[PDB]
Amino acid sequence: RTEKIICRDVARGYENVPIPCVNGVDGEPCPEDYKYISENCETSTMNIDRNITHLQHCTCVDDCSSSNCLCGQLSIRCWYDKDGRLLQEFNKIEPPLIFECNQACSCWRNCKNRVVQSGIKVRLQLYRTAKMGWGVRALQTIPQGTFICEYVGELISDAEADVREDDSYLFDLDNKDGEVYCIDARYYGNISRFINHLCDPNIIPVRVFMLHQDLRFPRIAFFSSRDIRTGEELGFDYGDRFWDIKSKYFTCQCGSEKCKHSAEAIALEQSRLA
Amino acid sequence: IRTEKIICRDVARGYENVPIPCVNGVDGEPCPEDYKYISENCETSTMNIDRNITHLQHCTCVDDCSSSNCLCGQLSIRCWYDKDGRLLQEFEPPLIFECNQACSCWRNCKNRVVQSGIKVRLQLYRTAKMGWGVRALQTIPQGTFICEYVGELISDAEADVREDDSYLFDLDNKDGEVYCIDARYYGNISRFINHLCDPNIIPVRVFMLHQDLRFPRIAFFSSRDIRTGEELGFDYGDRFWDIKSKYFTCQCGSEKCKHSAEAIALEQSRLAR
Ligand SMILES: Cc1c(C(=O)N[C@@H](CCC2CC2)C(=O)Nc2ccc(C#N)cc2)[nH]c2c1C(=O)CC(C)(C)C2
Ligand SMILES: Cc1c(C(=O)N[C@@H](CCC2CC2)C(=O)Nc2ccc(C#N)cc2)[nH]c2c1C(=O)CC(C)(C)C2
Ligand SMILES: Nc1ncnc2c1ncn2[C@@H]1O[C@H](C[C@@H](N)CC[C@H](N)C(=O)O)[C@@H](O)[C@H]1O
Ligand SMILES: Nc1ncnc2c1ncn2[C@@H]1O[C@H](C[C@@H](N)CC[C@H](N)C(=O)O)[C@@H](O)[C@H]1O
Ligand SMILES: [Zn+2]
Ligand SMILES: [Zn+2]
Ligand SMILES: [Zn+2]
Ligand SMILES: [Zn+2]
Ligand SMILES: [Zn+2]
Ligand SMILES: [Zn+2]
Ligand SMILES: [Zn+2]
Ligand SMILES: [Zn+2]
């Protein structure tokens, strides 16, 4: 079947680049059972602290590439290299919080510590996969450590998440201390709502602070964990919490030799304990 | 002969769509730094703007929002944008409702002028008699968006007690409590726009990515064709000058000046008759 292009830009011009949609698998048209938003939204108010006097900020008179940058120190160091990519030694299993520079800092808008707030730069495509519904793939090579996109949706409380019927787009912010919040991309979301789980993932989520530092509401940034080839599907590890629940209802279709959540893998992890 | 020096390549530090340089060919005054340049309004207490996406009025247009059927255009009061993004008015103050994240239209539709930011080239420069001012670096057709009045959102009760009121902009909320934008400590290029009795820009209230009626945003549009080099200015209003004329008079130098010593005396002469 021909790979028809069915939307020139699912983001309707809201991103720095278009995100087209194609389907060469079945007759499903472009997905429209949600509202594309490029930045997080609220229905009920979350009362995010946006008091500018509450911000920690730097006093740098350079490009914030020195070890003197107070915003880099809020994460030990600035984990961005000169090209805006995560460093090699960056912890990819236990990422630190990133504090980017903000409107209170003395530095310029193009300092070295503003990667996520500058938006999508790589060419992505929404496409129909063979076995996992819609997915997202790269239309270019992407070096390791490159910012891909943010997990964008509706900010909700943990209590609201628990009464939501469809949890297939629910991202837990993992607030360890105090009030717990989630991003639900079911009704409002961006391209990230279509990114599938891979047991051999090529992107990782990182918690980032930009225009506010209300620690209840980290923003979720995906960075590539290795070099990604053109045409390669993007995916992150949804985590054992997700699969511990969902695997009762469906198993992983990633098809990797390393797959941890397939029907075969589940049967092995069960036949063992027996 | 004193030469003009470029003393800052961009007072906005890269936050605007274009750089806004500062020059001084008048005196020894250094680039103004007794404030924090911000490109968007800030808060220093709980304002918590209502951004509930489900409560935004929005349109369903599948075109570029150029038709009269666009709900957002229909909500706008006594004004509209032409095909080039220029504001036309009837001349009750105008009120603009731009399209937003809830509308079905694209980010580049015809009802997105103010939210797309500064497009005209402006310069902060030292004036002869009015301190710093802002002038055009290009021809600006009538109705063109110039810049937004940006600063610290405060309640009118807080505005009543601020010590330096030289940068205080009253939003004049009709229904509900009144709020103000104070650009004294945090502000953008607009904090430097002087009063002119022959003004060439006008402030217009606008809603964009929220419709929290406490906080219209203030957008300046040209009220006539402006030539390169002309100082930009708006009418600060009689309420400003009724109070401030005790302390200083208007130095705009226009033959139409309303607030010089001579104009005030003449107005007092007219009232006495
Ligand atoms: C992967 C991850 C998450 C996360 O929420 N995943 C989602 C899966 C992906 C969403 C796109 C769906 C998840 O588990 N949903 C979920 C769980 C249970 C039920 C039920 N019944 C329903 C839905 N939260 C953090 C991570 C991290 O890697 C690190 C962190 C600090 C950013 C914190
Ligand atoms: C001009 C204007 C305003 C406005 O606040 N001006 C400022 C002057 C300019 C600021 C850049 C300084 C103003 O008066 N300050 C002020 C008044 C009294 C005292 C004392 N003691 C101190 C300071 N507010 C609207 C307008 C309009 O034209 C229409 C509107 C609907 C947008 C509503
Ligand atoms: N590895 C996977 N194996 C099977 N199904 C998956 C896998 N990854 C994602 N999915 C499906 O996609 C859902 C998660 C969505 N956030 C991803 C986009 C989804 N594919 C869609 O078409 O809307 C899951 O709840 C599954 O239904
Ligand atoms: N027409 C005017 N005549 C005299 N002073 C003016 C005039 N317009 C503005 N000013 C001065 O500028 C102040 C308002 C500021 N928002 C404008 C920028 C100011 N010129 C500065 O250098 O910072 C007023 O309180 C006056 O001190
Ligand atoms: Zn810094
Ligand atoms: Zn910086
Ligand atoms: Zn900083
Ligand atoms: Zn798998
Ligand atoms: Zn419309
Ligand atoms: Zn609209
Ligand atoms: Zn529109
Ligand atoms: Zn005057």
Author numbering:
A (entry chain A): 917 to 1190
B (entry chain B): 916 to 1006, 1010 to 1191
Paper text:
Further optimization studies finally generated RK-701 (compound 10), which potently inhibited G9a with an IC50 value of 23–27 nM, and GLP with an IC50 value of 53 nM. Like compound 1, RK-701 has a chiral center, and its R-enantiomer, RK-0133114, exhibited ~100-fold weaker inhibition than RK-701. Surface plasmon resonance (SPR) analysis confirmed the reversible binding of RK-701 to G9a but failed to detect the binding of RK-133114 to G9a, even at high concentrations. The pyrrole nitrogen and the adjacent carbamoyl oxygen and nitrogen atoms form hydrogen bonds with the main chain atoms of Asp1088 and Tyr1154. The pyrrole ring forms a π-π stack with the side chain of Phe1087. In addition, the aniline amide forms a hydrogen bond with the carbonyl oxygen of Leu1086, and its benzene ring forms a T-shaped π-π stack with the side chain of Phe1158. Kinetic analyses also support the idea that RK-701 is a histone H3 substrate-competitive inhibitor because the IC50 value increased linearly with elevating the histone H3 peptide concentration. On the other hand, a decrease in the IC50 value with increasing S-adenosyl methionine (SAM) concentration suggests uncompetitive inhibition with respect to SAM.
G9a and GLP catalyze the dimethylation of histone H3 lysine 9 (H3K9me2), which acts as an epigenetic repressive mark. Thus, G9a has emerged as an attractive target for SCD therapy. Our data suggest that BCL11A and ZBTB7A promote H3K9me2 by recruiting G9a to the BGLT3 gene locus, resulting in suppression of BGLT3 lncRNA transcription and subsequent γ-globin expression.
